[PDB]
């Protein structure tokens, strides 16, 4: 995460580290949405141009984490994966349309001060929260500045980071990139004429974009860290998988196991 503060303890208790087994490596972020389920980006698990395809015994999820130069005993719980569900219409060829995956844990996770699921929006909550100029929140352990090549490297923080980003009007989202955008994604971040900085970067993909309802006090996940061009570039905005448009697919998977 670019231009963020160190996160407080239990500030984002739904935040999940996606981790590789062979070899030991952080791959992506992710979010806790129940005790059996984790919400992540699809491209974190499936990317053919780089011959990337992960099974259940290759990956590992860690919830309730804060640091990274520390294994946090009796605080973080590490879940194994049972099954992986990736959207059939997920376009890895052009724009990352429907960049969304779900992961059922082998065993349920006990909730504590550090582990707690986020809310998924419905129609009414989506209509009152998803507006341009409204600020959401992105979380991750990814790079602090724009990397040269296209993944995780040197420039990591020792602790989970937090940034707040404004939702951006559709036209500006479209005029910011030559890449053909879709309606299953939205864009977020500050404008050149706004003089405040921040963006998600490598290793943050999969993590949540959240918003707090000013009425009911609950945190709702409106977005998933999906893609961008560079990190924190002037006139560029991070694109987040529109979680509500895909709530119909999620409802199907969870209810059908």
């Amino acid at each position: 995460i670019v231009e963020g503060s160190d996160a407080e303890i239990g500030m984002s208790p739904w935040q999940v580290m996606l981790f590789r087994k062979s070899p030991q490596e952080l791959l992506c972020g992710a979010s806790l949405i129940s005790d059996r389920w984790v919400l992540t980006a699809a491209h974190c698990l499936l990317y053919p141009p780089w011959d990337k395809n992960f099974t259940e015994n290759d990956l590992l999820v860690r919830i309730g984490k804060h640091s990274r130069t520390r294994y946090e005993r009796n605080i973080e719980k590490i879940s194994m994966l049972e099954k992986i569900y990736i959207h059939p219409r997920y376009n890895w060829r052009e724009n990352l349309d429907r960049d969304i995956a779900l992961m059922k844990l082998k065993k349920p996770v006990a909730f504590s001060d550090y582990i707690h699921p986020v809310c998924l929006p419905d129609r009414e909550t989506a209509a009152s929260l998803l507006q341009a100029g409204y600020k959401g929140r992105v979380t991750g352990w990814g790079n602090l500045k724009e990397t040269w090549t296209a993944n995780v490297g040197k420039g990591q923080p020792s602790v989970l980071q937090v940034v707040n980003l404004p939702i951006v009007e559709r036209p500006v989202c479209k005029d910011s990139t030559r890449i053909r955008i879709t309606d299953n994604m939205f864009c977020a971040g500050y404008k050149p004429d706004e003089g405040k900085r921040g963006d998600a970067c490598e290793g943050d993909a999969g993590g949540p974009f959240v918003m707090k309802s000013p009425f009911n006090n609950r945190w709702y996940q409106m977005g998933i860290v999906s893609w961008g061009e560079g990190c924190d570039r002037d006139g560029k905005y991070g694109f987040y998988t529109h979680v509500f448009r895909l709530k119909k697919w999620i409802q199907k998977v969870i209810d059908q196991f």
């Binding site: 503060s5 239990g10 500030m11 504590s112 707690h116 699921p117 986020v118 409204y134 707040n164 609950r218």
Partner: peptide, 29 residues
């Protein structure tokens, strides 16, 4: 709607984190 979105160390304790005022200002600013 479940126990979702309400944090044990914050919302359950009636406490704010350092940056959330920024988010709630966005509904007014």
């Amino acid at each position: 709607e479940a126990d979702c979105g309400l944090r044990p160390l914050f919302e359950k304790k009636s406490l704010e984190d350092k940056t959330e005022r920024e988010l709630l200002e966005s509904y007014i600013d």
